[PDB]
Structures are given as structure tokens and as C-alpha cells.
Amino acid sequence: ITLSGESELSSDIIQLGGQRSVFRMEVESIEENSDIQEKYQTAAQFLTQSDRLLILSPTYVDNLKELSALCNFMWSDSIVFRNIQTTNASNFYGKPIKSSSKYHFLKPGSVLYFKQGKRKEVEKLLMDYTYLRLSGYNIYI
RNA sequence: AUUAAGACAUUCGUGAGUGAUUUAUUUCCAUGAAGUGGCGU
């Protein structure tokens, strides 16, 4: 996590969804001169091949036809996404308004086999969603 | 505030009903209530 206007995220007992699921949160501080993205990619470096694009986190594309047109193969799988939509001034104690759309993301482990060149083009297509990339989605190696 | 929250695998339910420890088997086999007379040729 990256936090600004420092709020000291303390260790405590948390909930991570699903019939009162309890987890022990341990908060460890790391050097501030470090972005977490290339830390994750350094962890994933041992799975890289020049001809591939390993999908590390679920990846959403508004048009999979374009992505198919930019590759020789899509050795991929489908995952489903539906989010609980709640604002600040929300009930929090009633029926939860779940996401208006079920979204189909790729599966971690999917590989996109691009053609000659066009790797930068598929990278640009994948990275155009910045909210998703910041949230932890559409991460590849 | 997170495809969340809430929910005892629980209620009812006799290990119970039918059923002789009964059938077959000689307390029997062998066996003398018997032996001897004694006293003065």
C-alpha cells in the first residue's frame, strides 16, 4: 500500500468479506523511495519470456477483439467481477447495491502471444486503464 | 463497509415385535442269607 498525509495504519483484527472472515493484519514499513509496482514485477521476474505477456492479475479490456487482433494466441481464461457499490452517505445496513455490470477479466496465469513487434501496442492497450492498474488490476510481466 | 449481513443439520421417533433351555436317555449292571456242627468207641 501507498499512503499520503500519513495515517498510521495500525495492526488490528480486520474483515475481508464473507460470513465474518477474520484476518490478522501486520503492517510492515518499507523504504519510501520505492514504488511497489516494480517490487511486484521483481517478484515475478522469474517467469518472463520474450515472446509472452504473462497475466499476473485479472486483466480487463473493453474490446477483446482488438487484443485478439494484436496477438498470435490467447492462452487465457475468464474470471467474473462484481463489486459492492457504496458511497460515503450510504445505508451500510441494508441490501448492498452491487455493481451495475458483471465484468469479465482474464485469469492470473493467462498468456498473450503477440506477433512480431506490436508488444508496445498491447502494453499501451493494457495500461490505458489507470484506475484498474492503481487498484491492483491489469498487472503483467 | 469489502458479490456483504442474518440462520445450532434441526423437529418428530422405546432396539422393538415373534420365540418354554427344550429334545433323546431305565440308577442300572455283577452278586447264593449263606457256612460249619461239637461233645463220652
User: Which nucleotide C1' is nearest A80 CA?
Assistant: B3
Resolution in A: 2.8
Q: Which nucleotide is nearest to A94 (CA to C1')?
A: B5
Residue A91's nearest nucleotide, by CA–C1', is B1
Q: Which method was used?
A: cryo-EM
Looking at this protein, which amino acid is placed at residue A117? G
Closest to A125 in 3D by CA, of A32, A76, A60: A60
3-class SS letters over chain A: CCCCCCCCCCCCEEECCCCCCEEECCCCCCCCCCCHHHHHHHHHHHHCCCCCCEECCCCCCCCHHHHHHCCCEEECCEEEECCECCCCCCCCCCCCCECCCCEEEECCCCEEECCCCCHHHHHHHHHCCHHHHHHCCCCEC
| A95-113 core/surface letters (b: 16 or more CB in 10 A; e: else) | eeeeeeeebebbeeebbbe
What phi and psi values does residue A50 have, to the nearest 5 degrees? -65, -30
Would residue A109 be called left, alpha or beta, if left means φ above 0 and alpha means ψ between -120 and 50 degrees?
A: left
C-alpha span between A13 and A72 (Å, rounded): 47
The answer to whether strand B lies under 7 Å from the CB of residue A25 is: no
As ranges, strand B nucleotides with an atom below 7 A of a protein CB are 1-6
Provide, in whole angstroms, the distance separating residue A121's CA from nucleotide B37's C1': 159
d(CA A73, CA A85): 35
Q: Give the whole-angstrom CA distance, residue A5 versus residue A135.
A: 19
